[model samples]
Target: LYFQGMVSKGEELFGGIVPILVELEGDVNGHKFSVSGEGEGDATYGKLTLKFICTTGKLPVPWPTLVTTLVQCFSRYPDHMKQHDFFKSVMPEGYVQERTIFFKDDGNYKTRAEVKFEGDTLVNRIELKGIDFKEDGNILGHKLEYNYISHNVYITADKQKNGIKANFKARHNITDGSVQLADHYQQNTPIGDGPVILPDNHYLSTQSALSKDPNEKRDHMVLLEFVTAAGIT
Candidate 1:
């Protein structure tokens, strides 16, 4: 089942079922390292939906740290979050919502995200139907497209990172606005939670392309492909 693979991947990357909090050592964009929350498989959904919540209660850390930490935790169960409805409740306020449905044979997936309005809000709901396989090959042939809605929301930080040289601890509020990009184009919205997929390729092995412009679109695409490739490896 999809849930089985999701749980196994979570356990492989993270320690176990319980939430594990860790400190990020490096800086992203420009903010210094800070505290973040993470965990493996925290709940199950075979019998019924399982809800897992992680509350820090205003921990003293950089805003980016808090956001990244939460994202890292949720990344463990990408399929579950994409396929299950109950998992949305546990996400923190301003959390971005990202969804990706992989094609059965192409080894490619489409990702999207939504912005959360209130502290507790439902972002996106998804249901997986089944995979299509080719007659002659065992490889996945195509993916059945399931009907779903994508929420449109916008977000921006109060402060900006100045070329990887800035350090401050502050709480920022993310304001939501109309979703800009259309369904075909990947929308770039800023919220605490959303889908974050690395491109398929990259100019730098350890670098992540923050920009999605056509000039640099290939880089971003590479990042996504690289991330997905890493999942199977």
Candidate 2:
């Protein structure tokens, strides 16, 4: 999968915001799919909106390679899977978490897995869940859980080879004096760390850079934009 877009200035006081967009380019054996969302606040409280898009078509390779590539693209963050081994050790043997429904119970329909990292490691677990299965072998209500560690840590740079651009906003509420956070939108790579790579390719075109404005406030905004041309194969 691949994507490309630019930010458009909104209000006069506010500059144009570039929201993240994902595009489906090539697939291995099945259709390509992606989901995006924005959120506000810390661990305790926040609001968010999510959207997902899945392309139609099959790839040329076997299911394993297709699944592996898809996971690699989305699981690009560092430490995205630090607890994988721990999670695996605790789960029962042959505890399969089905991701797709096309394969047989024992052969196909197995959970797809992958690991991602940055300077440190941040492990994430994505599982495809089924709501019900009939005796006749029919399944329904499929969903996925994208769980990962949350540290609320961010960075700013002048330029990134292939990074993502993210922005967050917050305001103090007059009633309780608690901060009312706004939705945070970001232009990210198809995968988590797509923006951090070098030598532009299909998914991203530019590296990430930080803002130098002295008047800037809050934790951080406009983190980095991924270079589309540096996509991983």
Candidate 1 residue-wise lDDT, 88-200, digit = tens: 23233322333232222322223333323222222232111212323332112111211112221112221232001111121222223221111111222234343322222
Model 2 lDDT tens row, 25-101: 33222423332212111101111111222333222222211221121121122122222111112111111121333
Residue 201 of model 1 has an lDDT of 17
Candidate with top TM-score is: 1
User: Per-prediction count of colliding residue pairs?
Assistant: 18, 49
lDDT of each: 0.24, 0.23
Candidate number of the best lDDT = 1
